[PDB]
Amino acid sequence: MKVLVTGFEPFGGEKINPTERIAKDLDGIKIGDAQVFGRVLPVVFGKAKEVLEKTLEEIKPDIAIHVGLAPGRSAISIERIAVNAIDARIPDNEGKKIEDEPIVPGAPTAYFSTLPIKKIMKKLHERGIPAYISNSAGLYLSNYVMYLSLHHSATKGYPKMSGFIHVPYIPEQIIDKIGKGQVPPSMSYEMILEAVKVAIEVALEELL
Amino acid sequence: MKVLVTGFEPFGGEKINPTERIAKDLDGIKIGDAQVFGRVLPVVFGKAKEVLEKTLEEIKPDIAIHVGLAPGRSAISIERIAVNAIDARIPDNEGKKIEDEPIVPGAPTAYFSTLPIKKIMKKLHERGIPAYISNSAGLYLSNYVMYLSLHHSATKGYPKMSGFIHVPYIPEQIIDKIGKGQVPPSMSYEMILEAVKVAIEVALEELL
Amino acid sequence: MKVLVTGFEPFGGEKINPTERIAKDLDGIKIGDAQVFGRVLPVVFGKAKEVLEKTLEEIKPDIAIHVGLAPGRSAISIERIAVNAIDARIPDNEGKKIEDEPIVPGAPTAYFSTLPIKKIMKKLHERGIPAYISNSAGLYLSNYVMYLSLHHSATKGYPKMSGFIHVPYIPEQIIDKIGKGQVPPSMSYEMILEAVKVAIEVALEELL
Amino acid sequence: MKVLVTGFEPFGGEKINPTERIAKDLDGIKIGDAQVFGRVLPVVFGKAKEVLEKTLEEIKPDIAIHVGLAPGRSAISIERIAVNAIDARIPDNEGKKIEDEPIVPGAPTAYFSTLPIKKIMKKLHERGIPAYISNSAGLYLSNYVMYLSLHHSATKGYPKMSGFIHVPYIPEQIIDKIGKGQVPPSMSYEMILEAVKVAIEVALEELL
């Protein structure tokens, strides 16, 4: 049993992206006898696809859990659906702002996450971790990777389960926002890290 | 040097009020050679005034820092001003919903907090704790106690410094909110507790 | 040329649903030589499908624009995608709260709206009407009807264009919310009505 | 009977300030036999005080209703209190960003609005206009003028009634916000104008 967990590098002016640390922290750990691999993806259209594809082919995970930062969200959110479209509100890290373009021409308009999202949400709640089901992962890089992963699963037969989890800003990221007149929600890094570990465990238990 | 820190009991249907634990956790601790006293106040008009007054007279603190829960707020908020008015959106724990009534007839319309609010905010930021200055503590029990404390200071000469700090819900309080279709912001209990300790230290350092 | 515009009856405790009046106000009007039909749909799973299907078969519109109330949204929102799923946060008007169930088993995971959404948004902006593209119509009755309409189009060949538009609460609906301690955004009924008329005109101009 | 209504010029990068039009639209009208005067104030500390003072001395209104734009607010808000402090989050139109400074050294920490705020709110509700009582007018120019007007009343004996009303953005102001990734609430200019007229009528009826 192999699990791939991905995070993203900093973007949009932020100095950090908590999911980058999540990926690095979880890389190499084991849950039961399952091996976990953690990889960081660039917040760049095209390049992110290449890295994602190469990583999936290299590791051939049974489960893929892609994690990303969702500025403004107040709790862990588990994405229900990936959409075959790109409509960036802001450019990627290479200055590319793609508008109204499919991710994979001719492929399905959307794919449902194959992670046991409701069970994951329920377990998180039991652990005292606020979490809910999101019905839109946006149309930026998070959705981009989510869709490509699910498309890979439908086309290659692996990973068996694939999904996306968005996390709030961590507290330290809020500091310089205060002066800018606005205080978005945040969640401790420790809680977010534990949330991802829980998602992995629940996904694994769901498998065979 | 004596410091009084107060918290509130649960209210509005909530099973807990994190500031109650804060008061109990801080009671009896010492910062430098300063003695800290922690007391829990009832979320009841009239009764809260009695307890507050008796506590202030009993301990005669040099510094009073009153803490309360502010449902929906995303970061620590330091109250700048206390208003001589009661206009409860919800009833107190005794079912009393007082509307448009002064707290102390004939007394000043308002009192500015005498805690070094900007310095406290700055120190919190340096510690990676999101915090900002609130210009309204509401017109429920938090403002009620804040005003009475400052009025006590102006009338009795002590405490020398008095102010109010509102804290967000802690994560576990968000769980049953999710089903109700809504996810308010939260902050770890550990961070909130540390924030109050920091406020006390900064206030003390400001003193003499 | 025939255009079908639908609205919904009141739901969730609300005394009114502004889209009900929209449908009635637009029923029978003509834009150019195009005939407009306005119909109100029940906020009930199953029954809404029956009414929708019968209405589409009866009128056989070239364009279908389904309108609904989106509590909390601050501007007109044009739905980009319909999802093949039902996961009601609240029950329908018959007390039915369907969770994780496809709308049409075996049908596509999703359908993109075939209305010229970007052009509609642009025209609204030119008219001084705030509007944006929504990437999730929720998974309640709005999405339910949106999906069924698009599925009807893909399966029957008509309507040629189909989409959904969500509108904010109108001001009078906010009044009793104030006491409940919360003030959601609102938009005048006149502006919302004009927005729908504009969407129809833009859709028609896009046709042949 | 004379009524003074003031509005503010554009500020903070905005091309317009709806309260400027309100002041101009209401200038010269009569409600019953009461004469209404409308004046626009600069969003500049110091200068705004001069204009306000000269205007009050020139007209000597019995009632003064100062109106301002409150970006982000979703409904009409009637200010309950003016605070003797300036702490600008942004600079004024002259680039002056005053921090922690009293408006009138030695004067009261605050003044309660003398407009019949609850009656005004109630009448607005009856007219289907969302409105609520705000407990902080901020510490920028709105609060600045509100405090000075009330101080003038307490010191000079006129106006007999003075208060402040904040209004949301009007729809056209939201357009360029959408691209910036964010959609604040708005209210039609017509409703805002009517709200101010209602406030004036209620204030007048309250007088003698």
XYZ file of N, CA and C in Angstrom, chain B residues 80-81 83-87 99-100 109-112 118 135-136 138-139, chain D residues 80-81 83-87 99-100 109-112 118 135-136 138-139:
108
model
N -10.878 48.668 22.727
C -10.408 50.025 22.923
C -11.319 50.831 23.834
N -12.620 50.562 23.767
C -13.567 51.348 24.544
C -14.766 50.606 25.141
N -18.643 51.126 26.653
C -19.771 52.045 26.510
C -20.807 51.903 27.619
N -21.285 53.041 28.119
C -22.270 53.063 29.192
C -23.670 52.732 28.675
N -23.848 51.508 28.191
C -25.143 51.090 27.680
C -25.304 49.583 27.629
N -26.546 49.141 27.761
C -26.874 47.730 27.692
C -27.964 47.573 26.644
N -27.704 46.741 25.647
C -28.689 46.475 24.606
C -28.391 45.069 24.131
N -32.719 46.169 27.217
C -32.578 46.993 26.021
C -32.520 48.489 26.329
N -31.564 49.168 25.702
C -31.349 50.601 25.873
C -31.481 51.084 27.303
N -20.339 58.550 29.239
C -20.863 57.766 28.130
C -19.915 56.622 27.784
N -18.628 56.822 28.034
C -17.651 55.783 27.741
C -16.317 55.987 28.445
N -15.541 54.909 28.514
C -14.213 54.921 29.114
C -13.279 54.200 28.150
N -12.088 54.754 27.953
C -11.091 54.120 27.097
C -10.362 53.090 27.956
N -2.058 48.946 22.090
C -1.224 48.850 20.900
C 0.036 48.019 21.163
N -13.196 48.209 18.329
C -13.724 49.489 18.776
C -15.114 49.380 19.395
N -15.579 48.148 19.566
C -16.865 47.885 20.203
C -16.833 46.491 20.805
N -19.345 45.177 22.034
C -20.740 44.773 22.024
C -21.428 45.503 23.165
N -22.691 45.180 23.439
C -23.422 45.827 24.532
C -24.114 44.759 25.377
N -24.613 54.804 17.023
C -25.050 55.067 18.378
C -24.102 55.994 19.133
N -22.809 55.905 18.828
C -21.825 56.683 19.562
C -20.634 57.217 18.771
N -16.716 58.674 19.167
C -15.572 58.554 20.069
C -14.516 59.640 19.862
N -13.999 60.164 20.971
C -12.996 61.224 20.929
C -11.614 60.678 20.591
N -11.475 60.129 19.389
C -10.199 59.576 18.962
C -10.083 59.466 17.454
N -8.848 59.539 16.977
C -8.552 59.412 15.563
C -7.480 58.342 15.435
N -7.764 57.317 14.644
C -6.802 56.252 14.400
C -7.138 55.731 13.017
N -2.739 58.768 13.904
C -2.886 57.607 14.772
C -2.907 57.964 16.256
N -3.875 57.395 16.970
C -4.049 57.615 18.403
C -3.884 59.056 18.837
N -14.819 61.505 26.442
C -14.331 60.358 25.694
C -15.308 59.993 24.583
N -16.586 60.281 24.796
C -17.586 59.974 23.784
C -18.903 60.707 23.987
N -19.700 60.744 22.922
C -21.020 61.363 22.938
C -21.985 60.392 22.271
N -23.166 60.233 22.856
C -24.190 59.380 22.275
C -24.919 60.216 21.229
N -33.419 54.366 17.505
C -34.279 53.188 17.469
C -35.552 53.449 16.657
N -22.375 50.349 16.675
C -21.804 50.828 17.929
C -20.402 51.397 17.765
N -19.975 51.526 16.515
C -18.684 52.128 16.202
C -18.731 52.678 14.785
N -16.225 53.820 13.379
C -14.840 53.770 12.950
C -14.122 54.919 13.632
N -12.863 55.159 13.274
C -12.091 56.257 13.863
C -11.414 57.054 12.748
